[PDB]
Design a protein around this ligand. Structure first.
Ligand SMILES: *[C@@]([N])(=O)[N][C][C][C][C]([N])C([O])=O
Ligand SMILES: *[C@@]([N])(=O)[N][C][C][C][C]([N])C([O])=O
Lengths: 409, 409
């Protein structure tokens, strides 16, 4: 199994607890289909050099493993799940894939595609092709366009389709179709894998209100933090609060929604503010005047708690969550120039993955931010990911914790 | 000197003769000032990771040097010229630099910058800062904006400010101000360095008709080929023909103007068609229905040769130049998908530098084009330059031949 023996189920009650299991995805053939004319549509700042990108991702994975972390590759998890899934589950995955296809498939092409998918010899090949996209060449047919089924180039950012929330999970209604299609696999593994089937869902794609994993944070057993960004709307958080209040076993007591600049290239709260240690936060000063907060009471707020604006400054807001004096580390460090803050913020300089309290992994490129993290007492385990970074996401974006060890608060 | 013992002056009568001396420029501090909001303005497709960019450039230079080529760094050529220039030329360099500043300098800032420049102890320091740009921090002054004088980030694309033409040169009036400023150094070295001072100019920046080096090709002793592109206009070529005729020592007899797609990211003829061997050419099929041609008779066309339309298809046009059937190699090779052609054409897949007939240097990333070149009998010496490529130019763009050995046609 992709899961080691200790993995029981989803268990993520912090952003910093010693990481046990994490989900990743090395960019497959899907990124080979990104073209100049479709960059904006496919959500990339520039075309990645595929070979280097895959090499960079392997170093990322290696670093994770060197820290005794159980790394799970999306493709293998999906294929493992497919292998032990009921025939109906197997056929439904193929039908839903066809129905949610982009572009929308004429009936003739649907038949050809279904037959092509079903003719795949192995479980992994099936999954690979569904993620990669399908060309007229692959099908052996004539067509007025090369991509019969578009790629899912953003799959390597496993942070976004679904988020582990305590022992539950939120499978999202993503903002753009190009990524919405990714939640097909999320629904598949949680609805069918032995180790995940019991996982409760606090949100699902049918809900139609936009929300993505990069905006979801698990600060502690009591408080969740969700961004109001280019990808997640406040009304969606309100629905989430409702769904959580409706789940009895869920023990979270509060949600703090945090407003951030609605930039298409820094699209989630995690590209503006992250929690990297018990009392340490990394943020980009560029959002100084935009940050705005709302509290949701999941205890005494009724079955449908509403957002109550919290007028505290960022430091006071954070202190109200952890009950300790918070340390705020600015992108590029004290004394950085605006050019440096803009450039390092641009390359997701706030987006580090904490693998243990105060120990993080992130791109080596943001050197001034790396220096600032070290100076603040945080250990940085850099890895080279210049190509990967062109997809506009750093290490947090390319990971989805499945289980973290308890934090000694 | 930066020039080796044998360099005698400009000697470029082809695109493929054994390269003897070539001008390059390793990206200095100027690229650290590229910010996300200024990408389109500064002419970059994305922000380069500066450190890797410089390492990539050193590899490019190492490859050139491994092939017995005298590689000249622009900073050193300018500093060397400065050291031997008259006090009048030295002072004027600084005044013209201030006069042509972007943004335009206030009188107060003008005095501050001038003093700062004159206070630099070494000529290399002076050239470095003029290229890099100047911040309020560098000057130790208070200001509303950080950049008092903008960087000239594109300087590493030495192919464009001026072109060696036979034993003469064309110093250009470039399309955009951000690059026009680079010609300051071009005029300076050709007006003061003893080994360049006798070079005749067939064009200078004061003419105000747009033209750039990437559009200039020296096919052979009789024929010059100039692109009609996003950066060079047909009327400019007409003025060039006029200037060449006026020069009695010049021996070129014909100019073939070639119309190319006017794409902002594939801005010169050399991003669409290049000559890499005595009869081998690399082109992108994407320009197939756009290529159009004109002929200028430099011998019997009068004092002001006019462009005469040439109706031959590309193969016939090229044959009329080399008097031999050309071999046309398409980007990504035979059978490539349109996605492959679009991607490799995008990364300047046509932009290779010939260091001798049938032997070229260019980025390793365009693997299908590299394979097609080798399959066509051309030896490729690749190097990794993924960061450099984000500036939208390849090896030919990053070099300006100063002298080549005669070709044994
Ligand atoms: C991080 N979690 O903010 N996500 C980055 C996702 C980048 C991707 N290209 C997209 O969704 O735009
Ligand atoms: C090569 N000669 O085609 N020139 C590329 C120059 C790229 C640069 N960023 C600019 O001038 O746009």
């Amino acid at each position: 199994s992709v899961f080691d023996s200790k993995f029981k189920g989803i268990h993520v009650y912090s952003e910093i607890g010693e990481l046990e299991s994490v989900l990743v995805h090395e960019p497959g053939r899907e990124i080979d289909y990104i073209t100049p004319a479709r960059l904006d549509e496919l959500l990339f700042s520039a075309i990645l050099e595929s070979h280097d990108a895959r090499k960079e991702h392997k170093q990322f994975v290696a670093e994770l493993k060197a820290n005794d972390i159980n790394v799970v590759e999306l493709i293998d998890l999906v294929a493992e799940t497919y292998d032990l899934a009921s025939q109906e589950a197997k056929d439904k995955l193929i039908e839903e894939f066809l129905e949610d296809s982009e572009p929308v498939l004429s009936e003739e092409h649907k038949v050809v595609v279904r037959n092509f998918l079903k003719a795949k010899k192995t479980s992994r090949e099936l999954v690979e092709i569904m993620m990669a996209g399908i060309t007229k060449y692959d099908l052996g047919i004539e067509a007025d366009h090369e991509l019969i089924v578009d790629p899912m180039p953003n799959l390597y950012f496993t942070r976004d389709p679904f988020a582990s929330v305590g022992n539950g999970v939120t499978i999202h209604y993503m903002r753009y179709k190009v990524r919405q299609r990714e939640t097909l696999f999320s629904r598949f593994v949680f609805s069918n894998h032995p180790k995940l089937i019991n996982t409760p869902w606090y949100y699902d794609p049918s809900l139609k209100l936009s929300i993505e994993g990069g905006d979801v944070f698990i600060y502690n057993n009591d408080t969740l933090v969700v961004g109001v960004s280019e990808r997640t709307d406040l009304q969606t958080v309100t629905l989430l609060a409702k769904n959580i209040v409706a789940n009895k076993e869920c023990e979270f007591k509060r949600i703090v929604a945090i407003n951030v600049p609605k930039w298409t290239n820094l699209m989630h709260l995690d590209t503006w503010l992250t929690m990297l240690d018990k009392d340490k936060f990394l943020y980009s000063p560029i959002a100084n005047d935009v940050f705005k907060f709302w509290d949701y009471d999941l205890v005494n707020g009724g079955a449908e708690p509403q957002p109550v604006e919290n007028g505290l400054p960022l430091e006071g807001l954070l202190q109200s969550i952890i009950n300790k004096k918070p340390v705020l580390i600015p992108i590029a460090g004290e004394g950085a120039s605006q050019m440096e803050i803009e450039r390092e913020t641009h390359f997701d300089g706030t987006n580090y993955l904490a693998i243990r309290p105060g120990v993080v992994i992130g791109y080596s490129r943001n050197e001034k931010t790396n220096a600032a993290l070290e100076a603040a007492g945080i250990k940085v385990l850099p890895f080279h990911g210049n190509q990967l970074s062109l997809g506009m996401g750093n290490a947090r974006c390319m990971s989805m914790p499945l289980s973290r060890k308890d934090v000694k608060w």
